[PDB]
C-alpha cells in the first residue's frame, strides 16, 4: 500500500512567515512525501532566533525529511551541520519541479556547506529552473553529474563553481564507483550512481 502525504512548503500557509525550516516547524513535516511549495534551510535554523522565539534546530531531526520524494518548488540549502558528509536527509528526493524558483532563477541551490558529496541518490528529475552549487569547499562528485538527463525545460543551466578541486578530488579516492556509467554519481557508492554500467 503506497501512501502519499502533501504538506505546505516554507513561506506557504502553515509556514506563511517562516524564513527557514526550524526547530518549531520541522515536526510538522513528519510523514510528508510531497512539498507543495519550497524548502529553505538557512543558518538561522541552527543558531536559533529569539526574535521569533525559535530555539536552535537539533540536526538529528533533519532526518524527518527522508520521506520527501517530491518538491513542487525549489530546494535551497544554505546551511547544514558540519558532521554530516552529505544530504542523506534528502536521500529519497526524486523530483524537484521548480514551479517556484529562488531569485526567480534556481530550483536547486546548495551553497556554502562543508559536505563532501551531495548524496541525492534518488534524484531523477529537475523539471524546471537552474542549479547552483557553489562555495562548498569540500564537495566532490558534483561535476560528474549529467544534468541534461535530469532537466525538463529548454534553457536549464548549471552554475557549479568554487567547490573542491577536481584534481584534489581525483587525487584522493573521491571518484565515481567503477560500476557507474558516464552519467556521473552523487557519491562514491554504487547506490550513488545515476545509472549502472
Amino acid at each position, epitope marked *: 500500500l503506497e501512501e502519499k502525504k502533501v504538506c505546505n512548503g516554507i*513561506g506557504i500557509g502553515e509556514f506563511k*512567515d517562516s*524564513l*527557514s525550516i526550524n526547530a518549531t516547524n520541522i515536526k510538522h513535516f513528519k510523514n510528508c512525501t510531497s512539498i507543495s511549495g519550497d524548502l529553505h534551510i*538557512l*543558518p*538561522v535554523a541552527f*543558531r536559533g*532566533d*529569539s*526574535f*521569533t522565539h525559535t530555539p536552535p534546530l537539533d540536526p538529528q531531526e533533519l532526518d524527518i525529511l527522508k520521506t520527501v520524494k517530491e518538491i513542487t518548488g525549489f530546494l535551497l540549502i*544554505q*546551511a547544514w551541520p558540519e558532521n554530516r558528509t552529505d544530504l542523506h536527509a534528502f536521500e529519497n528526493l526524486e523530483i524537484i519541479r521548480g514551479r517556484t524558483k529562488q531569485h526567480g532563477q534556481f530550483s536547486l541551490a546548495v551553497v*556554502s556547506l562543508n559536505i563532501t558529496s551531495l548524496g541525492l541518490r534518488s534524484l531523477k528529475e529537475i523539471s524546471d529552473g537552474d542549479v547552483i552549487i557553489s*562555495g562548498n569547499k569540500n564537495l566532490c562528485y558534483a561535476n560528474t553529474i549529467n544534468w541534461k538527463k535530469l532537466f525538463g525545460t529548454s534553457g536549464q543551466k548549471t552554475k557549479i563553481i*568554487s567547490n573542491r578541486g577536481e584534481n584534489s578530488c581525483k587525487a584522493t579516492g573521491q571518484v565515481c564507483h567503477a560500476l557507474c556509467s558516464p552519467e556521473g554519481c552523487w557519491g562514491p557508492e554504487p547506490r550513488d550512481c545515476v545509472s549502472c554500467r
Partner: nanobody
Amino acid sequence: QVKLEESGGGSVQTGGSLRLTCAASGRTSRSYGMGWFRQAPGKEREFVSGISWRGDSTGYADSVKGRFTISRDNAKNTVDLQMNSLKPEDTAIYYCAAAAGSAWYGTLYEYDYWGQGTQVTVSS
C-alpha cells in the same frame, strides 16, 4: 523574505573615498545584523565590516580598520559602507548580507540573505 541590492560602486583612484549602500526590501521590520564582504579574483570571500540591528555594535576586519566606517538607517532600510584611503588591494566585488537576529557575524556562514554584488575597482 529580505532582498538586498548593493550600489555605489565603480572605478576609483588610489587615495580616494567611496560610499557603498545596501538597500533592503521585503520583510524588513525584524532584527537583522548586516555585514559587508568582498571577493577579489582568485581569493575567497572575506569579511569587511558588520553592524548590529540597533547599530550600536560594529566590527571591522584588520585590513580596513581606520579607513572604513559602517552605518545603517533602519528607517530608510539601508546600510552604508564609507571607504576612505582606498588602495588597489581593496579591488573586489563587494557583497552586502543580512543575518536574522540582532548581532553581526565575522563569517559568511551565519548570513541568511545575500546581495548580487557591486564591483569596486581601485587604480593608480
